[PDB]
Symmetry: C5
Subunit: 311 residues, 5 copies
Amino acid sequence: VSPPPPIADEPLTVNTGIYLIECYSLDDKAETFKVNAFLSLSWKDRRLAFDPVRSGVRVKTYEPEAIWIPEIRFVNVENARDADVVDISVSPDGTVQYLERFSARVLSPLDFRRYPFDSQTLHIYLIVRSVDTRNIVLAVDLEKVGKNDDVFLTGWDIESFTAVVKPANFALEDRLESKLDYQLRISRQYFSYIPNIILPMLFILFISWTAFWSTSYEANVTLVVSTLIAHIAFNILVETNLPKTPYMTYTGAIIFMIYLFYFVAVIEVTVQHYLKVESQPARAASITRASRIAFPVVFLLANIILAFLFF
Amino acid sequence: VSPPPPIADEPLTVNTGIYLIECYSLDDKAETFKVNAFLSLSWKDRRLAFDPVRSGVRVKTYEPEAIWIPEIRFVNVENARDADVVDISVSPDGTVQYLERFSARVLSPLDFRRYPFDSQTLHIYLIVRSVDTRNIVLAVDLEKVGKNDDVFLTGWDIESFTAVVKPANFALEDRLESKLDYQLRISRQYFSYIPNIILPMLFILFISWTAFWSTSYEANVTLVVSTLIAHIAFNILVETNLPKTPYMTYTGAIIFMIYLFYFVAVIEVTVQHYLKVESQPARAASITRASRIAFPVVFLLANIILAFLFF
Amino acid sequence: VSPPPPIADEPLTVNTGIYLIECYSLDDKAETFKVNAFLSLSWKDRRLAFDPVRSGVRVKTYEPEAIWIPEIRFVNVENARDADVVDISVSPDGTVQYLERFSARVLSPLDFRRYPFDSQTLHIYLIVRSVDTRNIVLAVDLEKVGKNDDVFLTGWDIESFTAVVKPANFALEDRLESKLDYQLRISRQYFSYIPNIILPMLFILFISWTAFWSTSYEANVTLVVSTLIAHIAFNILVETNLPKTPYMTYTGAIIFMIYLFYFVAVIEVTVQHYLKVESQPARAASITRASRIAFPVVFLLANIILAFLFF
Amino acid sequence: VSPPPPIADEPLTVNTGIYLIECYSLDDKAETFKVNAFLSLSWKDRRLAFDPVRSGVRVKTYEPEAIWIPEIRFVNVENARDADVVDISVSPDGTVQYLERFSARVLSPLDFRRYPFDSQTLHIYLIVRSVDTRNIVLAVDLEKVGKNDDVFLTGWDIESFTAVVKPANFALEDRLESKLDYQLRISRQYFSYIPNIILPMLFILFISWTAFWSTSYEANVTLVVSTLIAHIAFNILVETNLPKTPYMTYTGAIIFMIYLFYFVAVIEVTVQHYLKVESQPARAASITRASRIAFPVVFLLANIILAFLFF
Amino acid sequence: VSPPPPIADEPLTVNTGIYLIECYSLDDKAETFKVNAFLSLSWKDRRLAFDPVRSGVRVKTYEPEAIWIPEIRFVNVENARDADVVDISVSPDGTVQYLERFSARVLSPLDFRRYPFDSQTLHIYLIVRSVDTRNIVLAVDLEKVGKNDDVFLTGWDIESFTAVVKPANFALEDRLESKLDYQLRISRQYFSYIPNIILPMLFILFISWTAFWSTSYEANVTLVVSTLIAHIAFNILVETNLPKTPYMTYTGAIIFMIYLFYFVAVIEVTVQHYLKVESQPARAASITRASRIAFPVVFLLANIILAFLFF
């Protein structure tokens, strides 16, 4: 079926909007998330006009393959959306309300530069293939959008759903400049991560720093080295939660800092024993007493510095 | 084929019900479970009337694509159900018994806030696309439903299969207000988890608390630190069973409590040694004797508190 | 094409049988196994009669979509079998030999209650959709069945392939009572598991029990606790082989027994040291000497008890 | 289209051969490998005869669905090969050169009985569904076969590509006796495995055997037990490379031998300490001095025995 | 539709080029990467000629199935590209601009011989099935190619996108000699890997080398052996990042070097203790003092040698 005849040169603006249902599988490995939402389409077609008691039906349902519908295709998806038409209701006023449920594997980059405390911005791109006249998809309904009333994707906090049509193209064709952009700026709630990940590493590190309140070399070595083994094992346990992160993560900088602190603690214990064995107890005691206060303070300063360079 | 002519304005109520077969893969990662069950559909069509010895067939089987069938589609699924028609039997009374086997990837949130002892509630949503008259799917058969006689999904206990039609919609269309809801409230049997997960952590913790019956510093450090390593390794072993759980789990609060107890035990051992080395054996003995009773009691109180805040 | 005209009221019995080819992927996670076997179908149709030197062809191959074939569908599968017709040979006697290769994802519960020594029973269900007359699929060929001559699924031992038609239904329809059941009772060969899993845990446990031939407290603590860490690490190594097993496994009861034995060994070492430090060497020596014999004997008794309650 | 008329009773032999492209994913879990190769088919059809300057085209390309092509189907595959016709060139001589690219998930048993040094033999089976006359697929081209010039599947060494037509059938039909077998005997290069797996276990074992050059019981226990923990951790690290291997592997027999050696080393250390504590230093020294030479020699003998029973 | 009539014997050269969109999943296990890019096709067809104010449309969009398009198929892919036509614009000049979005699972070997610092070269192959006249696909647009402006695949650095048509074939057909090759030479940025992987292993190794500043045998054994356990655990942690790598990796040669260094350190500690116990303190002190400087120097030399043989 040919597109409805344009009465004038006015572009056939289509009213569009996605009502989110289930945003799940937010990281298959680290990147894709899947959506199973509805999208509502409204436009103007030369369908039934005002109908005062002639046919008796207001929402005249039509076959999905009968009436022409604009071709709207997602840009950043694995494959074409699994479109399943739910209800095509055409009103006598002259507008067609199209509602289809699709399950697309949306693509969006995940920026884990501040992993425990990050706030990502998922993206959905819309393009319309113009046939005879230019179609402007910039018409955002702003009334058929929104997630579920539960307001949680998979344990995430939604902040906004700004939909701005950016007059930009991927250096191709002519109608690509009219892209419709869906910005879902979600924020991760971090309460669970504080005891799940952050606190136990600090507890293990403090168990390590205990080694400065001991004059026994064997006990000090056991503390520091076995605590290093415990920290590596806990890192293995945590690593299941963390994504690939090929670049430098924030939580990948605290862990390296903790490794450096283990190395410095081993060096300090060795220096203490080395000075204590060769008839210099005063220097060993001075170094131990200095380190008792110097290690936590330097750790606090390092954490503050990392927070400043990352936030 | 057009829908059968409604004799009056009575909505074409369809009798529906799912007879579960195999509820498996209850957590692909943590969320979806797959079903391979049958669903039975019964309605009223202008098919063959009473047939006293004329055709000789009562269950007149018809082609799946011949007779019109109502469009019933699952809401919370990955894709359209893999419907496979088994038997369309139309009775001379005027009712069509439709039975199709489908394998849908049903979506349902899993609430692991009390993981070992939880009781989830899986969901299945039903909607009917009305064509000419409103279709009410609220007609639940209540006789063609139920799981297998084995009564086990994958090691779960079934409690009820309440099917309540909630007059609610997802703020879209007109017929979405007639949603049919299938509540399968399943409960997890916890006998295996007590020795699989809970008991060994307590055994490791008691091995740690042994360190209060020793006056040797090297032995105490070995006990506590190597027991911490053992606990982290056992946590890694357990973590395969546990799902993602981005929020605060109950079993994720006992583990953090155990980490805190390891930290406090290390602090206590250090305090004992620190006081014992500098000519204060009385204070060290007093602290050790107090801790012997104070650690298990505080652990019991903490477990009771966690149970109260979680249950 | 309509089914061949029944000469009388005799049900159209179809001769069926599956010749297994490759039973692989026996546990995708713990439950499904995939089959890529052939199934042979023989029935009676009003095809070419006796043909003495008229056409000259005995096995008159026909198009898969030309001649009607009975609808046989698997019950416990993910989706419809990937049927691929290989050869439809119709004999002048009046029988059609149908042979199709299918790759279905068969569903079958796996009962790991005696995991190392278990003997499962895989299942395949057959149903026929009757059209005009009742079709009885109880006709098992008993000559076109059997696995490969290699006699191994994926490292399993086949015992029987009993095919009993159970006059039972899933409380639905009328022809479901004629289900055809394929019981493949396979047994797992356990020789590899004895050194892969069972023996190393016993070796680690004996290394632990060594601690009763030592009067050194630090050495005893090192033995028992580091051996507990080694046992947990070996449990992690084993856990890859083991399936989910949400219920109480046999091999999940030996492991818990070993954990309990580690706890009791720690308690015994602590009691020995506690009595030895406070001027009671006689009691410590008596307890150690008793434990030397009492631990292996109690372990043997516990293993015998577990074997009796599990086998 | 009917098959070309056979001029005589000569079977329509088809020239076939696979030119391998990318043999990858050699173990999805342990068994299947995927192929994305081309297969060349040549036969004799009643197509255009000798064409001296009449049409002017030698390789007269035809539509894939226009000219009849023999039905060649893979036996040991997940599903039907993803056949994609590339070029059907028919020569005036009377032969059709058919070339299609397929991506089949070939099935082949992997025999890891000598894992580091094994030499598998992948298999591909060919069958032709005869229609009017018997088709013999035994015609192997022997000129359109071969892997890539790189000569590497995924880090494997190719030795031969023998293609022998075995007159055997799977006890079914009549034309199954003409199966075409493709034997790709590949060999695994083992240089990387010697430092990746074999050498570090030997280094850890030698670190264990160090314990016989020490008279300290605590140091001996630390060495042997912590080395056992290190060996188990390294076994966990290796296990990712190794496949399931439900049966007795060669590399699964060296590991068990190493576990037995750890147990015997613990027993020897205990015996040394037991004799040394009760006023028998001569016997302890004799046992230690004997063990120093007796452990490596027995290990060498055990390795030789395992090599003989496995190779 | 037949191909447009060639005016002369000039081959129908097609202008082609891929504009990359999302190069993700660069290692499903170790080898494949997926693309979801557009490809632009331009050729010459006998379509509408110069059109001065007759039809009024310049980019006359045509149906994807209406106008003939050349058959361009990817060679090294899992299956046929998921082609989705976006816009077929034919200009009055006589050229057709074809633009389709495809999501192909491109195959390309990954060469991890210098893993942390490598620079791979992904490949895409193009072939055209000639019908009547030879089609030369060597026409590279060089203006419709390029990745996203972000210039990052999944944390990779792009260096060039050279597109050279290599007159080579896979020893098959006649038109295979005209293959079009897309070389995307990407380089991996290594900043994150230095603290993620390389630095912690060096820290653990230095903790091991600490053992040469101690005269205590128990402390030395604890250091070296527990540090070996820590290194193996960290190797397990790293191994998730690393691919299969069946051959000899660079980062798989530093790790083996570190294992050898642990073995040599254990031997040195044993030699020190062995000489110290039997009244040779001078030799033990000399060996310790020599090793203090000899271990880091030999490690530096070994790293330089490995860098030279690998780079």
